[PDB]
Amino acid sequence: DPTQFEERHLKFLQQLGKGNFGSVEMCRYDPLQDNTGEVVAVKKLQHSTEEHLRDFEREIEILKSLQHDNIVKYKGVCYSAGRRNLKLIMEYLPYGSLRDYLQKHKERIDHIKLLQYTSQICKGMEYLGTKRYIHRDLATRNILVENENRVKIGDFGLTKVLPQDKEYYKVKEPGESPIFWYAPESLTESKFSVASDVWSFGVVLYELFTYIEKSKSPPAEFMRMIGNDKQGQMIVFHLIELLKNNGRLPRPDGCPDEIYMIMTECWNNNVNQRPSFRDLALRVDQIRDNM
Ligand SMILES: O=C1C=C(NC(=O)c2c(Cl)cccc2Cl)CC=N1
């Protein structure tokens, strides 16, 4: 059973980065001890507490249940003795995150490519929705590049399962929250739904078409609009008020009109009026077709 990886054969190669409750490492699974083994990505908890291990177990079950071209592949798990510490094994995607990839190559990635990635992100999100999963953390840093032609959603650390009887999930005690990607109802009532994920998708689209320019980031832009003097909880208070009054991220320089229209439709205060991921993939594929 190759979903069973012995921890002693996992050789540390590189620290890939940190996300929410965990860190990710590039490792070679090398049980022949001859450096010929498969290079994999390994997620583990920085603080393996009771609460976090339960959420992590749930995250693992989520990813394992997802099989789609635009979702990072689950490979297996590591169990440690006694205290039941858990490492999640996943495919290594050598081109790294879409955020770094875009920040590196900038405008050398043309609109053709950006919209391929957009389509692919939409398709992975639509599939996620059919499982009644809510990502809550859709952003270019959580999307990975497999090659020039393929991206995959790559982290599911905040993903929640909808209750049977509700179309939203309500987070009662929020931890670290990417508030500059959050829909107004997520800011005000901690309500997360397919529709709030669509809101965040519009921010990902903005990210893409700004080519991750630091001065143009959602945090830098929203902070400018509420005023750089706002701090801590007052940021959330002013952002809510900004969004209620139709304050929005600006159109990125050079952004095609029909792409910009999509962003602004995703950023609708009215939850029910936001497009669906099914329609977004269709629309985006139409635009690529025209090009
Ligand atoms: O090659 C990889 C890389 C992965 N994760 C990340 O790189 C990652 C980090 Cl380190 C922090 C936050 C978000 C993300 Cl997606 C997952 C699987 N295979």
Curated annotation (Swiss-Prot):
Organ and tissue specificity: Ubiquitously expressed throughout most tissues.
Residues annotated as domain Protein kinase: 10-285
Residues bound to ATP: 16-24, 43
Record-level Gene Ontology MF annotations: acetylcholine receptor binding; ATP binding; growth hormone receptor binding; heme binding; histone binding; histone H3Y41 kinase activity; identical protein binding; insulin receptor substrate binding
Cell compartments where the protein resides: Endomembrane system; Cytoplasm; Nucleus
Active site: 137
Post-translational modification: Autophosphorylated, leading to regulate its activity. Autophosphorylation on Tyr-29, Tyr-127 and Tyr-133 in response to growth hormone (GH) are required for maximal kinase activity. Also phosphorylated by TEC. Phosphorylated on tyrosine residues in response to interferon gamma signaling. Phosphorylated on tyrosine residues in response to a signaling cascade that is activated by increased cellular retinol.
Domain text: Possesses 2 protein kinase domains. The second one probably contains the catalytic domain, while the presence of slight differences suggest a different role for protein kinase 1.
Subunit comment: Interacts with EPOR, LYN, SIRPA, SH2B1 and TEC. Interacts with IL23R. Interacts with SKB1. Interacts with STAM2. Interacts with IFNGR2 (via intracellular domain). Interacts with LEPR (Isoform B). Interacts with HSP90AB1; promotes functional activation in a heat shock-dependent manner. Interacts with STRA6. Interacts with RHEX; this interaction occurs in a erythropoietin (EPO)-dependent manner. Interacts with ASB2; the interaction targets JAK2 for Notch-induced proteasomal degradation. Interacts with MPL/TPOR.
Disease as annotated in the protein's UniProt record: Chromosomal aberrations involving JAK2 are found in both chronic and acute forms of eosinophilic, lymphoblastic and myeloid leukemia. Translocation t(8;9)(p22;p24) with PCM1 links the protein kinase domain of JAK2 to the major portion of PCM1. Translocation t(9;12)(p24;p13) with ETV6.
Protein name: Tyrosine-protein kinase JAK2
Organism: Homo sapiens (Human)
Gene: JAK2
Portion of the full-length sequence here: 840 to 1130 of 1132
